[PDB]
Amino acid sequence: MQLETAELEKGLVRTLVDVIGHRLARDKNNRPNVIRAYPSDNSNDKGLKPDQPFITVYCQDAATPYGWVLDKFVEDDVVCYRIAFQIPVLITVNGKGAHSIMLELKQRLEMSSVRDLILEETGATVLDTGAIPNDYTYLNTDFENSAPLVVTLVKNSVLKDERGSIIERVIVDGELVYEEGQEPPEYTIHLDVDSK
């Protein structure tokens, strides 16, 4: 499995539709309003703001606090590497009662279930979950209630080194001497070992 935030966001979006979809608004296709941040298509088209309440998913960054390389192994003749990653994600609810919805979303991510569905879709484990503020932003006319939350994930990624190769034959030479630097060696041992 390779690590790609584009897939983690999609998996989280698909999971949230079932986990917390009953509290959200629904579009013309009856689907709950969960979307990825900064919507756009065809390199210039821009999405419209859905009907409230809705959810936004945005991946912040990715780091490797756990060393630099976790494993190096051979799976088939191609060499492989494994690396441990950490990915903080930001989920926000916009509308009225955003805090009341974020609280229930928090209380469900900690269940034994749900954490299995997340791993089934994204193949990642939930590591931490931060606090929830209760924000108000003026916009125009009326304030909008919002409630962000940060959910950190952990995943292992594997890549293939197509430039690598393996050793399958070894040739060894040796000598024996009574004294250091004895120019004609007392004995010479030549060895050759094949994998087969």
Binding site: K10, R14, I35, P39, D41, N42, D45
Partner: protein, 132 residues
């Protein structure tokens, strides 16, 4: 009138307004795009820090930003989240100009009712599709 129709340009209106969000959350623009022929008048927009054909120096290289004002009797529309429709596009010099602002002077007087729009040159970026 004659001065309101000095220029002829092409407008791309997304006739369908069926844009939606995929099961994965990505945005999918409305599908049916239609070309039209319109007539108006285009002039540079001189106000404040507006940038007409201004070269911009950046660590990444050089950019070019432009913006204009358009007088016409045709009713072009910008993006609207309540009505759930996207903005129109105006082709000037072979490049795209997205309608960002509108000013409704229609139904004011008989012979001088019209519209005003501020159109900004679209920035250069690579294309990606999410269609379901």
């Amino acid at each position: 009138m004659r001065l309101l129709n000095r220029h002829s340009f092409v407008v791309k209106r997304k006739v369908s307004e069926d844009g939606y969000y995929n099961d994965d959350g990505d945005w999918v623009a409305s599908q049916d795009i239609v070309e039209v022929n319109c007539k108006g008048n285009i002039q540079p927009y001189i106000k404040g820090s507006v940038k007409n054909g201004t070269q911009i120096a950046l660590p990444e290289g050089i950019r070019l930003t432009d913006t204009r004002i358009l007088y016409t009797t045709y009713k072009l529309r910008t993006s609207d989240d309540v009505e759930w429709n996207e903005s129109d596009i105006v082709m000037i010099d072979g490049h795209e100009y997205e309608v960002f602002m509108t000013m409704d002077w229609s139904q004011q007087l008989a012979h001088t009712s019209h519209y005003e729009y501020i159109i900004i040159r679209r920035d250069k970026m690579n294309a990606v599709r999410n269609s379901r």
